[PDB]
């Protein structure tokens, strides 16, 4: 099960999604505190 | 039939966010407005109730 869940393709998807989520959260912070 | 026609994640999240923004935040600032009573008035009341709350 874990060999299927942490396959390389799924790993790269998780990486991309985490990066974009961090970006959007920090952008929310930036546009909120500068208001 | 009655299982697969329930609201999916989008609608459930919309409901939760709507209750957070309108079931508490709306009536609270309504109370503030009546205590303090067109964008200028917006800025006025948000600033005042921000300060003294």
């Amino acid at each position: 099960f874990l060999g299927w869940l942490l396959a390389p393709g799924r790993l790269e998807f998780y990486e991309k999604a985490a990066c974009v989520a961090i970006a959007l959260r920090v952008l929310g912070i930036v546009i909120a505190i500068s208001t | 039939f009655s299982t697969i026609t329930q609201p999916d994640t989008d609608l459930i999240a919309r409901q939760e966010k709507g209750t957070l923004f309108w079931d508490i935040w709306a009536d609270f600032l309504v109370t503030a407005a009546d205590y303090y009573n067109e964008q200028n008035s917006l800025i006025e009341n948000i600033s005042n109730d921000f300060d003294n709350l």
Partner: protein, 68 residues
């Protein structure tokens, strides 16, 4: 194999003999629309004013109207 298929054929002929509803009265525990029976209706979100348009064409494609 002939017997085992004749069973199904008899069932299908019986279902054919019905042909519809003529002979069946209305029933109040089983209306014809499942939304009445299941108490389903819309809420406040998910309702756009641009939705009725697409609604109509769905209707137009269900009733057979070929115009679309």
């Amino acid at each position: 194999a002939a017997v085992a298929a004749g069973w199904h054929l008899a069932s299908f002929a019986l279902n054919l003999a019905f042909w519809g509803v003529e002979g069946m009265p209305p029933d109040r525990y089983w209306p014809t629309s499942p939304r009445i029976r299941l108490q389903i209706r819309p809420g406040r979100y998910g309702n756009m004013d641009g939705g009725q348009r697409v609604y109509m064409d769905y209707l137009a494609r269900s009733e057979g109207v070929p115009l679309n």
